[PDB]
Structure 1
Amino acid sequence: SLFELGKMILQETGKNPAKSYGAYGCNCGVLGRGKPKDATDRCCYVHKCCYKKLTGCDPKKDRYSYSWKDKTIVCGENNPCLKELCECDKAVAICLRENLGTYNKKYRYHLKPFCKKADPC
């Protein structure tokens, strides 16, 4: 669920999720996958692809449990889809953090036209 996704991003990056990622490049935010602008955008690209692997669970709103253990994201079990949904979220949060160095604000506000077809996930 968006609420834990955002929270994980906050915990990992220390950044306001909605704002830094809400509309970022072609993949971070509303809509679907697009050709990534940079490493950050990629994270979200991979994240949406991860979201496809899911069936059963609803990523946008399905709640799941996870804890912040030693500044690490750890979700407890929730069941198949929910758990791997968390892992999707955890992955993107870490990925956004790992890529803060190339984070580029010009990609922060949003425009999609430039977002060419995305390769198969």
Structure 2
Amino acid sequence: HLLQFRKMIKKMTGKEPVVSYAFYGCYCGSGGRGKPKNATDRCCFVHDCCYEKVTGCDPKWDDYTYSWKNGTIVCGGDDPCKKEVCECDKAAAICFRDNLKTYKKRYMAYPDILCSSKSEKC
């Protein structure tokens, strides 16, 4: 579920996801279009390519099970599809954390019309 993804981001990043990430760049949030704006926008590009692989379940609205065991997200459960989407979310939050230093405030709330017409390939 996206609300779980939201907690993973808030925890690792310290920022309120709905404000700082929901509308960043060209690939964060919605779907995505063009070429990733920056390091953080690429984290979203990948997260998008990830959700594209999940077949058996709904990565957006399906609740998965994970644990913050040891300051790290621990994806669990007996369902591999859900565990799959959980690993997608876990990787993105980590990605956001590692690139926090190159986060530009000018890209949050970024206009899509300004995004490339040639989208990058997963």
- Which segment drifts farther, 53-62 or 28-37? 28-37
Q: 2:89 and 2:56 mapped to 1: Cα distance?
A: 16
Aligned to 2:13: 13
Mapping of residues 1-121 of structure 1, within 5 Å: 1-116=1-116, 117-121=118-122
Q: 1:119 and 1:45 mapped to 2: Cα distance?
A: 9
Q: CA deviation at 1:31?
A: 2.8
Q: CA deviation at 1:33?
A: 4.4
SS in 2 for 1:70: coil
Q: CA deviation at 1:60?
A: 1.1
Where structure 2 has 5 or more consecutive residues not aligned to the other structure, the ranges are none
Q: 2:57 corresponds to which letter in structure 1?
A: C
- Which segment drifts farther, 53-62 or 30-39? 30-39
Q: Per-residue displacement from partner, 1:25-51 (whole Å, max 9, x unpaired)?
A: 001111334311100000000000001
Q: 1:85 and 1:108 mapped to 2: Cα distance?
A: 24
- Which segment drifts farther, 32-41 or 60-69? 32-41
- Which segment drifts farther, 67-76 or 111-120? 111-120
In structure 2, the CA distance between the partners of 1:35 and 1:68, relative to structure 1 (3 Å rule), is same
**Does the CA contact (< 8 Å) of 1:65 and 1:78 recur in 2?**
no
**Does the CA contact (< 8 Å) of 1:26 and 1:34 recur in 2?**
yes
Q: 1:84 and 1:7 mapped to 2: Cα distance?
A: 17
Percent of pairs identical after alignment? 60
TM-score, normalising length: structure 1: 0.94
Where structure 1 has 5 or more consecutive residues not aligned to the other structure, the ranges are none
TM-score, normalising length: structure 2: 0.94
Q: Over aligned residue pairs, what C-alpha RMSD do you find?
A: 1.1
